[PDB]
Write a protein that binds this DNA or RNA. Structure first.
Ligand SMILES: [Mg+2]
Ligand SMILES: [Mg+2]
Ligand SMILES: [Mg+2]
Ligand SMILES: [Mg+2]
Ligand SMILES: [Mg+2]
Ligand SMILES: [Mg+2]
Ligand SMILES: [Mg+2]
Ligand SMILES: [Mg+2]
Ligand SMILES: [Mg+2]
Ligand SMILES: [Mg+2]
Ligand SMILES: [Mg+2]
Ligand SMILES: [Mg+2]
Ligand SMILES: [Mg+2]
Ligand SMILES: [Mg+2]
Ligand SMILES: [Mg+2]
Ligand SMILES: [Mg+2]
Ligand SMILES: [Mg+2]
Ligand SMILES: [Mg+2]
Ligand SMILES: [Mg+2]
Ligand SMILES: [Mg+2]
Ligand SMILES: [Mg+2]
Ligand SMILES: [Mg+2]
Lengths: 206, 80, 60, 63, 67, 143, 141, 64, 55, 145
RNA sequence: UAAUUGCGAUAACGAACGAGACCUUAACCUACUAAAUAGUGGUGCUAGCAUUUGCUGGUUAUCCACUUCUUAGAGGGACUAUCGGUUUCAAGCCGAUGGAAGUUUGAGGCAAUAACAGGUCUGUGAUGCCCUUAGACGUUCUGGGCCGCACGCGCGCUACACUGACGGAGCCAGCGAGUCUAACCUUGGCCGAGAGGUCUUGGUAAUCUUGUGAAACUCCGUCGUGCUGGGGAUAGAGCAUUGUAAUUAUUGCUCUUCAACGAGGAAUUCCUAGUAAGCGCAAGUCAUCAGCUUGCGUUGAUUACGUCCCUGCCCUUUGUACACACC
C-alpha cells in the first residue's frame, strides 16, 4: 500500500486507510446495498466519507436533503429534545459507539445493518384524515419513497431515545438494540411496532 | 469673550427650506388668516419659489371642539 | 458604530416596537515629516465644518 | 405476499383538503405502459418508485 | 421570484426600439453599453435593464414579440 | 528527532507531568488543600485528593509555556466554569484567586516560571527544559 | 526566500491563515502537529485533504496554520479549507496546470466546502423575541 | 440498594465463568459502580478484546 | 404593637386557608365603556356655520 | 483501583449517631442521612481520619469509626476551620459549633423561638408560617400550607 | 408575482405617489490605494529539545520587505446567467452546470391615501378648559408604602437526570463600553477558602482593561438507577461588598436545612437554514440590584418546499330604508 512518511507523524493506521479501497474509519462503504428496490435513489450510501459531520446545505432546495450521506441524516436525528439541540459532536460519538457495537454479534457490515434497519421501518401504507363529513374515516394512503426513510429514521431514534431514558443502558446500546431488530424486523423494535400499526389501519379502510 | 462671535446670513430663497415656510403660516394663522387661504398661500408661494413639490398639514381644532385635519399639496412628492 | 435602542412610543402602549439609532464615527491619523513654519499653513484651510482636526507632536 | 412494481410516469397535483397528498399516475415495472394511478403522503418528484399492496384498487380525489 | 418591474421593462423596449445595430446578444457587452448610451442611476438597476434587453434580443432572433 | 510540548496529546501529557511531579516530591503545597472548592462556582472539591495540585500544577505551566505571560487573574477565568445559582440561570465566574496565586509561587520556588516584566509570569528558562524531556517521556508511550 | 504561498479559509467567524513553505513536509496548526487537535472525531475532517489528493504530495512543501476567532468546530472547517486552497495555490505558481487541475477536480468532486468558502452566516435578531425568526409567546387575552 | 452492588463473594465466582459466551460486554448481580473498573481488572489477563476506546461506553469481546 | 401582631390570633396562613376566597377574585375585565365608544357622550354638537368659519 | 473480594466483614446495615446507613452505598456518600451533614463537610473529614473513600459502607473496620465522630463531635481541636460549619458566634457564648443530630432540628427552634420571644419582625413572620426573607408573597408559595 | 409585480385580454392610450428603485448591514475579490493604534515573511538579539542543516517560543521597534490574513477607502461583481424542461411556448416558473452569492441574494431602513373618539395632559417650560393654590393638589424634610397575602390569570427562570450531574482536564467567539475637573473600564504583586481586601500600573482607547482563555461543547474519571450524588425551593448560623441608611432579609461567599417536582388534563404558543432549539456574552437599566429587554456570537437539527380544512384578513359580486355609516 505504498506508504509515505515524513516529519509530522501520520500512523501506519490512517496511512493504511486512504485511497486504497475507501471505507469508513473502520467500516466498509462498499457492500452496503439496499435490499429494497424502492429506496434505491433515496438512501445515500456510496459516495463515502468516514466521519459524519458535513457543512452541507440540504434544505435550501427541496430534495437535496435526499443525497445527504444517510448515516449522517441519521445522526443529526439524535441532536434532539432541546436538551440535545446542538451536541452534534456528542451525537457523532454515540454513532461511532453505536457502530462498534452491532459488530457485537452481527458480523455484517454495520452500515449494512442500518440500511437494513430503515428498509423494514418504512410505513409503505398509512392513513389520512379525510374531511368526508363530520365523523369521517381514514383513507388508505401510500407514503413516499423518502417520507418512508424520514419516517423510518425518526421512528428508529424516538424509540431508542425513550428506551435509554430512566435506565443505565447507554443510548449507544438502545440504538444498537433497535437496529438489530430493525435489520430484519423481529418482534421488539419500537420502530417496526409503530410501523405495523401505522399500516394495519391503512387496511381498516377499503 | 472672543472664543466665539456670531454672524447673520439671510437664507437663499427661503421657500424651499421648510422651517422658513412652516413658521410662515404660524404667523399667518396667528394674525387671523383663513386656514385654507393662508395654507394655499404658502403652497402657491413655495411653488413659484422653485420647489418641485410641496405639502402642508394642519391638525387640531379651529373653533369646532373636535379636531379635523386638512392637507394642502402641489406638484410632485416621493415618500419612499 | 454608536447605537441607541429605544421604544418608539412616548408611552408604554401598543406592540413593543424598538428602534436602533446610529451615529457613525471616522477618525484618521496621518504621521507627518514637516518643518516648523507649515505648522500653520495646513491649519486654517484644512477645515470643512464637520471635521474635528487635532495635531501635536510626540514620541512621548 | 403479493407486492407491486410502481414507477411514477408523471404526476398530477395536490388533492386532499389541507393539501398533504397528491394523485400520482404510475407505471407497472411488470407488464408496463400500464394503468392505474394511486396517491401518496410524502413529498415526491418524478421518476420515483413505490410498493402497493393491492393494485386492483384506486380511489379518486380526496374530500 | 422576481418578475421585473416595468420601469426596467419600459426602458428595455425603448432601446431595442432604437439601437439594434448595437445591442449585442450578450449581457456584459449590453451592460457596458448603457453606462455610455443611457443615464441610469445604479449598477443594480441597469444590470436588469441590460439583463432584460438581452433576453428580449434572444427572442426577436426567434420571431417577433409584442412591443 | 526533537520533540516539543506542541507535539504531544493534551491530557496524556499533562497527566504525565502529574505522575512526574507527584513522585518527585518538591511541591510546597500551602497545606490547606483538603477543602477548597477551586472556585465559588464549583459544587465540590476535586476528587483525586492526594494530588490534583500536581494535575493543576501540570496544566499550571503548559499554559504558561505556550504564551508570553499571564497573571493570577487570567487563570481564574480559565478554570472558572459555569456556576449553577440554583434556580437562577448559569453564569461563568472566575476560579479561586489563591489556589492559583501560589500554585504559581509554589513551583516558581521550584523554578519553572519567572516573575515576568510587563506584568505577569513568564515560563522559566529551566522550565523551558523541564520542557521537551516532558514528553520524550510520553512519546515513550507509543515509542 | 524559497518558493512559498499564503492562503486562508473561512467558516463563519473563524478564519484560518495558511502559509505553505517549500520544505520537508511539516503540518503544524498553531504550533502543533495535525496529529491530534482533539475535537478528535472531527480530526478526519481535516485529515481528509491529504487522503483525497493522495497523501504523498507533501514531500517538498511545508504547511502551518493559525486560527483566530471561530469556535471549537468553526475553525476545524476553516483550516481544511485553508490548506486545500494553499496546496492548490502552490500548484498555481510553482508546478504546472494539469498537475493543478487534477486536485481542484479531485477536491470539488468530493468537496465538503473544501474550496468554495461556505457562504452561510448568523442571521440578526429582530425585536419581538429572543431569536432570529422566533417570536415571544403570545397571550390572546 | 437493590441486588448486590458490592463484591458479594460468591459473585466473584459467576463473573469468572460468565465472561465466555459473550459477543458483547458493558456496564450493562452487578451494581454499576463496582462494574466500571472490574472491566480492566479483566484485561489484566487474556479475558477480553477491547474493541472500544473510551469512557461512558466500553466494548470488549471474547478472548481470541 | 408587635406583641399585638403575634398575640391577636386573627392571623397567619392557618387562619386564612381556613376560609374561602371571595369569588370576585376570580372575575373578569367587566369592560367598562368599550362598547359605547363611537357615540359621543358630550350631549353637544358643533354648528356647521361655525365649523365652516373655522375651516 | 482493581477488584478485591473480602470476607463477611461487610455488614449491610448499621445504625450510628442515631441514624441508619446502607452498607451497599459509598462511605463518602451515605454519611449524609444524619442532619447537619453536607456532601462537603463529610468529604473533608474522612481521610482527615485516615480512611480511603473509594470503597463501600458496611466496610471500613469499626476502629476508625469510633472516632470519625470525635472529629465531627469535636471539629476544631482536630483542625477544621471555623468558617466550614453551621454555627459560628453561635448566638450567646461566641463559640463556634457544628450541630449534627436530632439536635439540628432542636437548634433550629432555639433560634426560631428566640426571635419570637424577642418580638423581632422575622419571628412574627415565622410564627405566622410565611416566607421570612422578603420574597413577594402574592403569586408564590400557595398550596403546600 | 412578495407586490395595481407583470404577461396577456382590452375604449382606452400613455404616466406619477405607494411597491420596485433606493439606503444600510452581512457575505466576494492574492486587482488600486497601505497602516508599531492591523498583521505576514526574512533577519538581527535570544530560550529549549534533538542534532545533520531542524522544530517551539522570547524580543514596544534591532533592522529589511510585503498587504494574504485585519482594517476602511475607491472600484468591480449578479443581471436569476448558461443550457435545458414547463407554459397562450408570453410574463414567468422549475431542474442541472457555473458561481462569493441565484429564497425580493439573507437581514433590516424607509414607506402613499384613509381610517381609531386606540394609547400618551405621568416625558416635555407642548397645550385649551376645569379644579386647587398658604390648615396647598405648590414645595421640601422625616418615616412608611408601591414588595403588603385564603386565591384567579399571564411573560419567565431552574428542573424531574445516565445524550446526566459531578470532579479534574482539554479550551474556542462575536456585538459592545469605558475616568476631568476624576473616581470609569481595570491588567499586574501580595493577603484571604471564598467573597473580597490591599499595593501599583495601562487606557479619553483598534494603543490599556482583552485572545474578553464566556458557556454550552471535546477528553478522563467517580457515581448506578434507587426522589439517587438528579432537583435546589424553604430555612438557620457566619463572613464580605454597595450605600447617609440594607430590618420587610439590595447583591456576593461559606457551612448546614434538602420540599415540590418521576415528562404535565382541557387547552394554546413560536418557527422552514446557519433558521429552530440548547449555550453563554455585551449593552440599556445601574451607587448596589436581571430570572427583563436590546444586540452578539457559540453548537447546530427534525420536517415543509403544500393546501384553504381550521382561523384571520383582504378581494369581487350582491342586498341595503345605514352616510354620526351595524357601537
Ligand atoms: Mg416610488
Ligand atoms: Mg472555561
Ligand atoms: Mg473548566
Ligand atoms: Mg441550575
Ligand atoms: Mg437563556
Ligand atoms: Mg444532609
Ligand atoms: Mg487585502
Ligand atoms: Mg451548483
Ligand atoms: Mg378612549
Ligand atoms: Mg404627552
Ligand atoms: Mg402638565
Ligand atoms: Mg409595581
Ligand atoms: Mg410578553
Ligand atoms: Mg463537566
Ligand atoms: Mg481567613
Ligand atoms: Mg435526593
Ligand atoms: Mg445539585
Ligand atoms: Mg414533552
Ligand atoms: Mg448590568
Ligand atoms: Mg424593565
Ligand atoms: Mg349599492
Ligand atoms: Mg351586531
Amino acid at each position: 500500500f505504498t506508504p509515505v512518511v515524513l516529519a509530522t507523524p501520520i500512523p501506519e493506521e490512517v496511512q493504511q486507510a486512504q485511497t486504497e479501497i475507501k471505507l469508513f474509519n473502520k467500516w466498509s462503504f462498499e457492500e452496503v446495498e439496499v435490499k429494497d428496490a424502492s429506496l434505491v435513489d433515496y438512501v445515500q450510501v456510496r459516495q463515502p466519507i468516514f466521519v459524519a459531520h458535513t457543512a452541507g446545505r440540504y434544505a435550501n432546495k427541496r430534495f437535496r436533503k435526499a443525497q445527504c450521506p444517510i448515516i449522517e441524516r441519521l445522526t443529526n436525528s439524535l441532536m434532539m429534545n432541546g436538551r440535545n439541540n446542538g451536541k452534534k459532536l456528542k451525537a457523532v460519538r454515540i454513532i461511532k459507539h453505536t457502530l462498534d457495537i452491532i459488530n457485537v454479534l452481527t458480523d455484517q457490515n454495520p452500515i449494512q445493518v442500518v440500511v437494513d434497519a430503515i428498509t423494514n421501518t418504512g410505513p409503505r401504507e398509512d392513513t389520512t384524515r379525510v374531511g368526508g363529513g363530520g365523523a369521517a374515516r381514514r383513507q388508505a394512503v401510500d407514503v413516499s419513497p423518502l417520507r418512508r426513510v424520514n419516517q423510518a429514521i425518526a421512528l428508529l431514534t424516538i424509540g431508542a431515545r425513550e428506551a435509554a431514558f430512566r435506565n443505565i443502558k447507554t443510548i449507544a446500546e438502545t440504538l444498537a438494540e433497535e437496529l438489530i431488530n430493525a435489520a430484519k424486523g423481529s418482534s421488539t423494535s419500537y420502530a417496526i411496532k409503530k410501523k405495523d400499526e401505522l399500516e394495519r389501519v391503512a387496511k381498516s379502510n377499503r | 469673550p472672543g472664543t466665539i462671535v456670531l454672524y447673520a446670513e439671510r437664507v437663499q430663497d427661503r421657500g424651499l427650506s421648510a422651517v422658513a415656510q412652516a413658521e410662515s403660516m404660524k404667523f399667518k394663522l396667528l394674525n387671523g388668516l383663513a386656514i385654507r387661504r393662508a395654507a394655499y398661500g404658502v403652497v402657491r408661494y413655495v411653488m413659484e419659489s422653485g420647489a418641485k413639490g410641496c405639502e402642508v398639514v394642519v391638525s387640531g381644532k379651529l373653533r369646532a371642539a373636535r379636531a379635523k385635519a386638512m392637507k394642502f399639496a402641489d406638484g410632485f412628492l416621493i415618500h419612499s | 458604530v454608536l447605537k441607541i435602542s429605544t421604544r418608539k412610543t412616548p408611552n408604554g402602549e401598543g406592540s413593543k416596537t424598538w428602534e436602533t439609532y446610529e451615529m457613525r464615527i471616522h477618525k484618521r491619523y496621518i504621521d507627518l515629516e514637516a518643518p516648523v513654519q507649515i505648522v500653520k499653513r495646513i491649519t486654517q484651510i484644512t477645515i470643512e465644518p464637520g471635521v474635528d482636526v487635532e495635531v501635536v507632536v510626540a514620541s512621548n | 405476499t403479493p407486492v407491486t412494481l410502481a414507477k411514477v410516469i408523471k404526476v398530477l397535483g395536490r388533492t386532499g383538503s389541507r393539501g398533504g397528498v397528491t394523485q400520482v399516475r404510475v407505471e407497472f415495472l411488470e407488464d408496463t405502459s400500464r394503468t392505474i394511478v394511486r396517491n401518496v403522503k410524502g413529498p415526491v418528484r418524478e421518476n420515483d418508485i413505490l410498493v402497493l399492496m393491492e393494485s386492483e384498487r384506486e380511489a379518486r380525489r380526496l374530500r | 421570484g422576481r418578475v421585473r418591474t416595468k420601469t426596467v421593462k419600459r426602458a428595455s423596449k425603448a432601446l431595442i426600439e432604437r439601437y439594434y445595430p448595437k445591442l449585442t446578444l450578450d449581457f456584459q457587452t449590453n451592460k457596458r453599453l448603457c453606462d455610455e448610451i443611457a443615464t441610469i442611476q445604479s449598477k443594480r438597476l441597469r444590470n436588469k435593464i441590460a439583463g432584460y434587453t438581452t433576453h428580449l434580443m434572444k427572442r426577436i432572433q426567434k420571431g417577433p414579440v409584442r412591443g | 528527532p526533537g520533540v516539543s510540548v506542541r507535539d504531544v496529546a493534551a491530557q496524556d501529557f499533562i497527566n504525565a507531568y502529574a505522575s512526574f511531579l507527584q513522585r518527585q516530591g518538591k511541591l510546597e503545597v500551602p497545606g490547606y488543600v483538603d477543602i477548597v472548592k477551586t472556585s465559588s462556582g464549583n459544587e465540590m472539591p476535586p476528587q483525586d485528593a492526594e494530588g490534583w495540585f500536581y494535575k493543576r500544577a501540570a496544566s499550571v505551566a503548559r499554559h504558561i509555556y505556550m504564551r508570553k505571560q499571564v497573571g493570577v487573574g487570567k487563570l481564574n477565568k480559565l478554570y472558572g466554569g459555569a456556576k449553577s445559582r440554583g434556580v437562577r440561570p448559569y453564569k461563568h465566574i472566575d476560579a479561586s484567586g489563591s489556589i492559583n496565586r501560589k500554585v504559581l509561587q509554589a513551583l516558581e520556588k521550584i523554578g519553572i516560571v519567572e516573575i515576568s516584566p510587563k506584568g505577569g509570569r513568564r515560563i522559566s528558562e529551566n522550565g523551558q527544559r523541564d520542557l521537551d524531556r516532558i514528553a520524550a517521556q510520553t512519546l515513550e508511550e507509543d515509542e | 526566500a524559497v518558493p512559498s504561498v499564503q492562503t486562508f479559509g473561512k467558516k463563519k467567524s473563524a478564519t484560518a491563515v495558511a502559509h505553505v513553505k517549500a520544505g520537508k513536509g511539516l503540518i503544524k496548526v498553531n504550533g502543533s502537529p495535525i496529529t491530534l487537535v482533539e475535537p478528535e472525531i472531527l480530526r478526519f475532517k481535516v485529515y481528509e485533504p491529504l487522503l483525497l489528493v493522495g497523501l504523498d504530495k507533501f514531500s517538498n512543501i511545508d504547511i502551518r496554520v493559525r486560527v483566530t476567532g471561530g469556535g471549537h468546530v468553526s475553525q476545524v472547517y476553516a483550516i481544511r479549507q485553508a490548506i486545500a486552497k494553499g496546496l492548490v495555490a502552490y500548484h498555481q505558481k510553482y508546478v504546472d496546470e494539469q498537475s493543478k487541475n487534477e486536485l481542484k477536480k479531485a477536491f470539488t468532486s468530493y468537496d465538503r466546502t473544501l474550496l468554495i468558502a461556505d457562504s452561510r452566516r448568523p442571521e440578526p435578531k429582530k425585536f419581538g423575541g429572543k431569536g432570529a425568526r422566533s417570536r415571544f409567546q403570545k397571550s390572546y387575552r | 440498594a437493590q441486588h448486590a452492588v458490592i463484591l458479594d463473594q460468591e459473585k466473584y465466582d459467576r463473573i469468572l465463568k460468565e465472561v465466555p459466551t459473550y459477543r458483547y460486554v458493558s456496564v450493562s448481580k452487578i451494581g454499576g459502580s463496582l462494574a466500571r473498573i472490574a472491566l480492566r481488572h479483566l484485561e489484566k489477563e487474556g479475558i477480553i478484546k477491547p474493541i472500544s476506546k473510551h469512557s461512558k461506553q466500553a466494548i470488549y469481546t471474547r478472548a481470541t | 404593637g408587635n406583641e399585638g401582631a403575634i398575640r391577636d390570633k386573627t392571623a397567619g396562613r392557618r387562619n386564612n386557608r381556613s376560609k374561602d376566597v371571595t369569588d370576585s377574585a376570580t372575575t373578569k375585565k367587566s369592560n367598562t365603556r368599550r362598547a359605547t365608544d363611537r357615540h359621543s357622550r358630550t350631549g353637544k354638537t358643533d354648528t356647521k356655520k361655525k365649523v365652516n368659519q373655522g375651516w | 483501583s482493581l477488584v478485591v473480594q473480602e470476607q463477611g466483614s461487610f455488614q449491610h446495615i448499621l445504625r450510628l449517631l442515631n441514624t441508619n446507613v446502607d452498607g451497599n452505598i459509598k462511605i463518602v456518600y451515605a454519611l449524609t442521612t444524619i442532619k447537619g451533614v453536607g456532601r462537603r463537610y463529610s468529604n473533608l473529614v474522612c481521610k482527615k481520619a485516615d480512611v480511603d473513600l473509594h470503597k463501600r459502607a458496611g466496610e471500613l473496620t469499626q476502629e476508625e469509626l469510633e472516632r470519625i465522630v470525635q472529629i465531627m463531635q469535636n471539629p476544631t481541636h482536630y483542625k477544621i476551620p471555623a468558617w466550614f460549619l453551621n454555627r459560628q458566634n453561635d448566638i450567646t457564648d461566641g463559640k463556634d459549633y457544628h450541630t449534627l443530630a436530632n439536635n439540628v432540628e432542636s437548634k433550629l427552634r432555639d433560634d426560631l423561638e428566640r426571635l419570637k420571644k424577642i418580638r423581632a419582625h422575622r419571628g412574627i413572620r415565622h410564627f405566622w408560617g410565611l416566607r421570612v426573607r422578603g420574597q413577594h408573597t402574592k403569586t408564590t408559595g400557595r398550596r403546600r400550607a
